[PDB]
Point group: C3
Chain length 148, copies 3
């Protein structure tokens, strides 16, 4: 069977006067992520990981973030691949993310037409190190397994 | 078959006053991590990720009365993975540290992790990098670990 | 069905007076990557992912930055030797995915050429090789153009 892996990375700046939206979840917070889209860093990383596993290039070449994630899933099926699983990590010093994880996972599973058991989201701080540790941005990493 | 992938990430600050333990191995150095075993946490997270069981924070709470060092957590991680129905196929990882030289300690880390995961030694890999003097990592202010894991249901 | 995954990371400083070589592509630029070999950050990251999947250690060990024979070494030759060792250990490569993170220059015009180089070196079709390019959204040493980072993932089978 023809399995493929993909990995994705994203980061966005935390700025005043934007809502904080991660994995489709709006999180109460003084700042939000800056981007041309809704800057959903988690969804962007998953999107890149899915495009990478299908060898379809990247999000910058192809393109709210859930609509884009749905379009990615479409283009991935279009190339003849089915999604097996997604795993990810959010790196954010603040705010606390644990209470929103299940919602993110629910959002992603719905967007990718996957059961909850094939979608995972993990949260981490950066132990006060670098721009992430100073709360200047939020990073997401993703890994996706697909099969043709 | 029903294969799944997971990925893991971890970082800790590097300062005088603590031992340096990476992958179960105490390494002589003028600094240490605030056991704070970056490599084992990353691998733990990667395993929980592949299993879709959340993350290290949800399983082993920083307050929970039952928690032990990072090898014990790794061992526990692996039993939870097994019970969800998953066999571990392989782990690969990278440690990024500007100093000390990590190459000498890799075989011991691979041995500890393989022991802890009940894996054949040739299914466990650890790699070493510096940050080429860039950022907090390159200034020796912290050490990062990265992990990938493949499992099967 | 004996599948294995590997992952890779690399970063090099971006300095004046060096060629900029990423994915085997020499990119016109006033700066280039600093290292012992040609400093091709993307190929090193993929090489690490491949050694990692086969559990063969790492590129720093197979191709040491302290060994003079690798001075100015062609990282495509290094990737091809890696692939040869991975094959020798019994693995076939199934796919590679990767990311390059750089403030500058624009990498989109060069991505297809990089993909082509990697596919050639690994004896893979283009449809099993992927290279993604981003910026770091102006953040950190990458945002300041002090270095270029690459990340990689590889799937192999014994
Ligand atoms: O680098 C942040 C970023 C750029 N980009 C383009 C499409 S989605 C997206 N995220
Ligand atoms: O980011 C450092 C860190 C946080 N955390 C929570 C459980 S194990 C662990 N390492
Ligand atoms: O850390 C940058 C680096 C060192 N090294 C040794 C062989 S390939 C390579 N890239
Ligand atoms: Cl940037
Ligand atoms: K990083
Ligand atoms: Zn983004
Ligand atoms: Zn940790
Ligand atoms: Zn390198």
């Amino acid at each position: 069977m023809d399995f493929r892996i993909g990995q994705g990375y994203d980061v966005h700046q935390l700025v005043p006067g934007r809502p904080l939206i991660i994995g489709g979840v709006t999180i109460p917070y003084e700042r939000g992520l800056l981007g041309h889209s809704d800057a959903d860093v988690l969804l962007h990383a998953i999107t890149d990981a899915l495009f990478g596993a299908a060898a379809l290039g990247d999000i910058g070449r192809h393109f709210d973030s859930r609509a884009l994630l749905r379009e990615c899933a479409s283009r991935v099926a279009q190339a003849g691949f089915a999604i097996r699983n997604v795993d990810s990590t959010i790196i954010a010093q603040a705010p606390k993310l644990a209470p929103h994880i299940d919602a993110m996972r629910a959002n992603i599973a719905a967007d990718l037409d996957l059961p909850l058991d094939r979608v995972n989201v993990k949260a981490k701080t950066n132990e006060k190190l670098g721009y992430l540790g100073r709360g200047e941005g939020i990073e997401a990493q993703a890994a996706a397994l697909v099969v043709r």
